[PDB]
């Protein structure tokens, strides 16, 4: 039940990470779609946001090495 | 892929209206224009076996409305292949 991918219209970009640091666990993992209740489609769309965040170094692959 | 910028022009030339696209000389030239532009796809990389059934589809259907124009107006049939050139 969130106003992210239901009322928050038009794909959520990874530029504003003041919200994406809520979707990743403080390490680098992703929070399951059964935890933060969002429709599987947009959890893959947020999976596209987090993926490109891992490609442009905003949201890493993991915390440290 | 048959660009829309070209489709509306073929229907503009061959078809007698902007939207009277359900006629013989339209659907044929349209699908023929698909092939004519599809050259770039089945020339390079070559190994598109799944895209082969897509070809199968549109080429055969084309030969189906020609399959009908033949039984109706042989004057326009030889004329259609004469303007655009879709026999060869």
């Amino acid at each position: 039940f969130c106003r992210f991918t239901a009322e928050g219209v038009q794909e959520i970009d990874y530029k504003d990470i003041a919200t994406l640091k809520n979707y990743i666990t403080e390490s680098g993992k992703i929070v399951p779609s059964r935890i933060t209740g969002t429709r599987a489609k947009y959890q893959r769309q947020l999976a596209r946001a987090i993926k490109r965040a891992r490609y442009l170094s905003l949201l890493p692959y993991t915390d440290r090495h | 892929s048959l660009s829309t910028e070209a489709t509306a022009k073929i229907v503009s030339e061959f078809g007698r209206d902007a939207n009277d696209t359900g006629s013989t000389e339209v659907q044929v030239a349209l699908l023929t224009a698909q092939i004519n532009h599809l050259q770039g796809h089945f020339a390079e990389h070559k190994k598109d076996h799944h895209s082969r059934r897509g070809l199968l589809r549109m080429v055969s259907q084309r030969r189906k409305l020609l399959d009908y124009l033949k039984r109706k107006d042989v004057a326009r049939y030889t004329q259609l292949i004469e303007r655009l050139g879709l026999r060869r």
Binding site: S27, K29, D63 | -
Partner: protein, 65 residues
């Protein structure tokens, strides 16, 4: 991944470790891949997970003893 907590512990406490992933890497890297298991267990597994919910709705009807 990494837990600190300055000095109110007097214990190892692997809480955040097991809260992040910890074993989730070991379970997949110890033995051979076996190209078949994914198909198998993704399906079988979640099917049975759905049954618990189905159990919730079908166990409250009668039971009049």
């Amino acid at each position: 991944i990494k837990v600190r907590e300055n000095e109110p512990f007097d214990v190892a406490l692997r809480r955040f470790k097991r809260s992040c992933e910890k074993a989730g890497v070991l379970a997949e890297v110890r033995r051979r891949e076996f190209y078949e298991k994914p198909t198998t267990e993704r399906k079988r597994a979640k099917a049975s997970a759905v049954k618990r919910h189905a159990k919730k709705l079908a166990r409250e009807n009668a039971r009049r003893t």
